[PDB]
Ligand binder design. Structure first.
Ligand SMILES: [Ca+2]
Ligand SMILES: [Ca+2]
Ligand SMILES: [Ca+2]
Ligand SMILES: [Ca+2]
Ligand SMILES: [Cl-]
Ligand SMILES: [Cl-]
Ligand SMILES: [Cl-]
Ligand SMILES: [Cl-]
Length: 687
């Protein structure tokens, strides 16, 4: 099947995701509605269930509302069984309508539907060429007070109906009992409770096994992607090991996490997570910047391009960035009382920009509302005639049809305070996008250059956002034109490719034996060669091969990041997909603890070792800075690390700070890791 197929679970840049808060979209089945204090019939309390469900989503697929927009993926609230108790917070009755307060990850939230309903949703979506992404929140269960078992449901965790444990009498040690985080440090936010949510202890193998089993259940039903909740609040090492187990199993899928960033914020740990965890991220840098430029109008198009350029520089897999202009955790993009062009332009940019675009339900209806839960009102209308609906309808399909949009580089062609003209390019395909955010002033555009072949190009939007046609000369030079006030236009060229071009490889990380999906153009119909670094993969190493997609088995090559490339049956070489992370083997999560490691203020302890997963003795790749406040206390340090299973590791600790790097003396520490699951190794610092 082709790169654009709904069957393609691991790569999503040809898609447009529509993010649905299930309870707030459509009530398709009144018979599963919660009742009494848990339900708001008059919708006056935005913290109770309103009744939205899976049948409702199914209905809006079948009746053409969603398909008419050209969305090709649905991202839905966590589907698992949540607590059913009503909690009074700050004078207001609250429910689990949002899906984040799980109690049994192996059963459904009955308010949304049963497993038959869920299968119908998967099957209906797939029959319409729509992928399904679920929220998954393995950080915690639900609200709990260790000292008051009667509060809520005491964070109780069930396994297909049978009790594993609750928070107050945590016999099996399933949870952390370290208080609640104050969000002051990353460590603090990982090993203490997020708000009052009973925090899962993933270093307990019972929990590693449980969550692997649970996710396998949902993936086995046909789920195409996973949006991880609160990734900043779980150990990086556990998450890396977790996704590796997905990639090495029967159901590799696209994964991405939420690591919130405010306006004007870049974060090195956020970048490391996206580059090294094996999991992708929502692109808050993009989102916040688009909001500043279009919604708040506090920064310029030059600032916008700067962020496109800096994100490109820092993230290894830029076609995996999940972009958006708002979501369940942000004020609604539409400002009440303001015009709609800001929304329409922000949508157009997102739909034509690199990555995987996501649109929050009701954006296309200009829904307003600041703060949670005002930003989660019931869908106001299913009017297919709005300008925003038509913008998405016109541009969403380009991600499937034009590989420059799906995979292409990004280049600034023209910029001033109010106007941005960018070009996407992939092989001979290109798209040129022009946006003028100024609603009162038109701008003459002169000396514009493009990679478009000669000829006249109509605006893909046909002037819906006051765009215009352009004429292109032999050298790609664009005849002078005026970009109207509020103007937005898209001009595009798609061509058959003869030379092979790789647009994406997914997943981006894997152990030998995993099957990866290589998407692009010009691979031809006859099986050729896949390369990992200089190592050729041929014959049975190639699972399947067609013009736009190749599936290949990761060869037993040296672990570490490497380039992936192809060569056609005729011997023509492709470009290289950079930074594919070859793992040593199946992973386990190991908690490393080192004792008696005293340091001066400003100096931290890091972990290094012989395996690629331990940085291959490179002090610049040393793992850390390690933690020393919660699980273990200074001068003990600890860190949870994904390492190859059933493998003898050689390792040492180092102290880095003040431009100095000091390694342990003595011989290496050694440790043979567990065959599966999780482990712990404790050693003492060697002077
Ligand atoms: Ca319902
Ligand atoms: Ca239909
Ligand atoms: Ca946690
Ligand atoms: Ca900014
Ligand atoms: Cl169906
Ligand atoms: Cl290219
Ligand atoms: Cl093409
Ligand atoms: Cl083959």
């Amino acid at each position: 099947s082709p790169d654009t197929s709904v069957d393609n679970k691991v790569n999503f840049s040809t898609d447009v995701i529509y993010q649905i808060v299930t309870d707030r979209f459509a009530d398709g089945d009144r018979t599963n509605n919660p009742a009494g204090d848990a339900f708001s019939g008059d919708r006056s309390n935005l913290k109770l269930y309103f009744g939205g469900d899976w049948q409702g989503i199914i209905d809006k697929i079948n009746d053409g509302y969603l398909t008419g927009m050209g969305v090709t993926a649905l991202w839905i609230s966590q589907p698992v069984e949540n607590i059913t108790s009503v909690i009074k917070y700050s004078g207001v009755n609250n429910t689990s309508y949002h899906g984040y307060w799980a109690r049994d990850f192996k059963q459904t939230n009955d308010a949304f539907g049963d497993f038959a309903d869920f299968q119908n949703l998967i099957d209906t979506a797939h029959a319409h060429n729509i992928k399904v992404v679920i929220d998954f929140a393995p950080n915690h269960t639900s609200p709990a007070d260790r000292d008051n078992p009667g509060f809520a449901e005491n964070g109780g965790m069930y396994d297909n109906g049978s009790l594993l444990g609750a928070y107050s009498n945590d016999t099996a040690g399933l949870f952390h009992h370290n208080g609640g985080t104050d969000f002051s440090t990353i460590e603090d936010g990982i090993y203490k409770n997020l708000y009052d949510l009973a925090d899962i202890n993933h270093n307990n193998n019972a929990m590693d096994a449980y969550f692997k089993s649970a996710i396998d259940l949902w993936l086995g039903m046909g789920v195409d992607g996973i949006r991880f909740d609160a990734v900043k609040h779980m150990p990086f090492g556990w998450q890396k090991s977790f996704v590796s187990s997905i990639y090495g199993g029967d159901h590799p899928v696209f994964t991405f996490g939420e690591w919130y960033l405010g306006a004007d914020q870049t974060d090195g740990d956020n970048i490391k997570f996206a580059n090294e965890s094996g999991m992708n991220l929502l692109d808050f840098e993009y989102a916040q910047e688009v909001r500043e430029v279009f919604r708040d109008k506090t920064e310029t198009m030059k600032d916008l391009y700067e962020v496109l350029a800096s994100t490109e520089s820092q993230y290894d897999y830029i076609n995996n960035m999940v972009t958006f202009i708002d979501n369940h955790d942000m004020d609604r993009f539409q400002v009440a009382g303001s015009g709609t062009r800001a929304t329409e332009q922000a949508l157009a940019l997102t739909l034509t920009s690199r990555g995987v675009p996501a649109i929050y339900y009701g954006t296309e209806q200009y829904m307003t509302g600041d703060g949670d839960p005002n930003n989660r009102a019931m869908m106001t209308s299913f009017n297919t005639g709005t300008t925003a609906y038509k913008v998405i309808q016109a541009l969403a399909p380009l991600r499937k049809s034009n590989p420059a949009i799906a995979y292409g580089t990004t280049t600034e062609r023209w910029v001033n305070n109010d106007v941005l003209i960018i070009e996407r390019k992939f092989g001979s395909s290109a798209a040129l996008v022009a946006i003028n955010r100024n609603s009162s002033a038109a701008y003459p555009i002169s000396g514009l250059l493009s990679s478009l072949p000669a000829g006249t190009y109509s605006d893909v939007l046909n002037g819906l956002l006051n765009g215009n046609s352009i004429t292109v000369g032999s050298g790609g030079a664009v005849t002078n034109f005026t970009l109207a006030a509020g103007g937005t236009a898209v001009w595009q060229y798609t061509a058959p490719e003869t030379s092979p071009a790789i647009g994406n490889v997914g997943p981006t990380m894997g152990q030998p034996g995993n099957i990866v999906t290589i998407d692009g153009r010009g691979f031809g119909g006859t099986a050729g060669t896949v390369y990992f670094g200089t190592t050729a993969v041929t014959g049975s190493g190639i699972v399947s091969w067609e013009d736009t997609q190749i599936k290949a088995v990761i060869p037993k090559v040296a672990a570490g990041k490497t380039g992936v490339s192809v060569k056609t049956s005729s011997g023509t070489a492709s470009n290289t997909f950079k930074s594919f992370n070859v793992l040593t083997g199946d992973q386990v999560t190991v908690r490393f603890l080192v004792n008696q490691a005293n340091t001066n203020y400003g100096t931290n302890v890091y972990l290094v070792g012989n395996a690629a997963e331990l940085g291959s003795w490179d002090p610049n790749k040393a793992i850390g800075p390690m933690y020393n406040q919660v699980i273990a206390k200074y001068p003990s340090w600890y860190y949870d690390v994904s390492v190859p299973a059933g493998t003898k590791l050689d390792f040492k600790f180092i102290k880095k700070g003040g431009g100095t790097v000091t390694w342990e003396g003595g011989g290496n520490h050694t440790y043979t890791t567990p065959a599966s699951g999780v482990g712990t190794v404790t050693v003492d610092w060697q002077n």
